[PDB]
A = this chain, B = another copy of it.
Amino acid sequence: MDSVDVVVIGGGQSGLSAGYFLRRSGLSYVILDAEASPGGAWQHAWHSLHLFSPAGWSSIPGWPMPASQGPYPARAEVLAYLAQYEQKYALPVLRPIRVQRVSHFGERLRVVARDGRQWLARAVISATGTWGEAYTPEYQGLESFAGIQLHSAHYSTPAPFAGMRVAIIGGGNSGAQILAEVSTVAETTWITRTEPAFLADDVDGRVLFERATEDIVMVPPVLDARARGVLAAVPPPARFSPTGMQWADGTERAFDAVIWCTGFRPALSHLKGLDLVTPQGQVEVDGSGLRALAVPSVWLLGYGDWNGMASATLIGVTRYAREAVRQVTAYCA
């Protein structure tokens, strides 16, 4: 049972960012991550994925992302970056470890792994991301649909959908990008809640970051899809049928497959039992967005806007990582 000052849970961009700042502190720490390789959830993104901002705009603290081959970073490059980042700062990343549970051990916290390894931490920084909690909504008659379903989290390639009629549900960047790729081999139908909003052709995802005083980027395959005229959105249906869907007015479309691009929740099963997870799947944090209210020794990092505006982006996590790390450095004194 190692005693450390800080345990960081999750070894993605968020955890590596926390790491960079903890290195410059005087504190003893470790970073626990469940994956086989470095790179967080990017290891699970689909093959064609590219970022929506250039390398300079996709960089975490200190060492920036190397310039990419094309205008936008490819999935591969993001992995290469995050790999080389750990080495560059020789960060204490133990991998693979699945943290099962964090629980009270007197004044400190006890972090337990699936295989019985244990750590004793004065502080914990949860940086586990969202990929692990894919969200599918509940629609009437869904349990009856005979076709194929998957979440965007497991989308990989358009091939399997060749020649099918396919519903893409969700109107974010993901929906748009996957719609773009699947429309190349399938009769496609984009189902969105509100009619989608595209940024301008001459601008990129850095814009979403610039709203940090407090929608979807025209990345090349999206430009292409627009030009092929497949970016028409339709409102949600009313019911699912065994073979398709049905709308308010009674119009019926058949589908062979459905791809849920309906987002994710924070992956905080390891904090259940500390009673920190709200029924909305978040935690209640202080005004800085970072520190948990019900248990002062737990900080959270990188999860999304409730945990800091644009914290769930490469560029935007840096600020909160700094703040979280100086906050805990104070706590350890």
Residue of B nearest to A1 (CB): B160
The reply to whether A257 and B160 contact each other, CB–CB distance below 8 Å, is no
CB distance from A107 to the nearest CB of B (A): 16
- Fill in one digit per residue for A151-169: 1 if any B CB lies within 8 Å of its CB, else 0: 0001111001100000000
In chain A between 30 and 69, which residues have their CB closer than 8 angstroms to a CB of chain B? 36
In the complex, A88 has a CB within 8 A of chain B: no
- Whether A160 contacts B36 by the Cβ 8 Å rule is no
A148 interface residue per 8 A CB criterion: yes
- Asked if B148 contacts A116 (CB within 8 A), the reply is yes
Contact with A155, one of B115, B146, B150 (Cβ below 8 angstroms) = B115
Which residues of A, 139-195, contact B by the 8 Å Cβ criterion? 146, 148, 150, 154-157, 160-161
B160-A114 in contact (CB<8A): no
CA distance A103 to B145 in the complex (A): 12
Asked if residues A116 and B160 are in contact (CB atoms below 8 Å), the reply is: yes
Interface residue from B103, B116, B117, B154 paired with A115 (Cβ < 8 Å): B154
Contacts of A146 in B (CB 8 A): 103
Counting every copy of the chain, the complex holds: 2
Q: Is A283 an interface residue (CB 8 A)?
A: no
A36 to B156, CA, bound (A): 16
CA of A112 to CA of B147 in the docked complex: distance in angstroms? Answer: 10
CB-CB contacts below 8 Å: A222-273 with B: 257, 259
Chain B residues contacting A114 (CB-CB under 8 Å) are 150, 154
Q: How far is the CA of A117 from the CA of B159 in the complex (A)?
A: 8
Encode A82-123 as 1/0 by CB contact (under 8 A) with B. Answer: 000000000000000000000100000000101111100000
Residues of B within 8 A of A154 (CB): 114-116
Contact of A156 among B115, B118, B148, B157 (CB under 8 A): B115
Please name the residue on chain B nearest to A150 by beta carbon: B116
In the complex, which residues of chain B have a beta carbon less than 8 angstroms from the beta carbon of A157? 115
Chain B: minimal CB distance from A148 (Å): 5
CA distance A257 to B156 in the complex (A): 41
Interface residues of A (CB under 8 A from B): 36, 103, 112, 114-118, 146, 148, 150, 154-157, 160-161, 257, 259
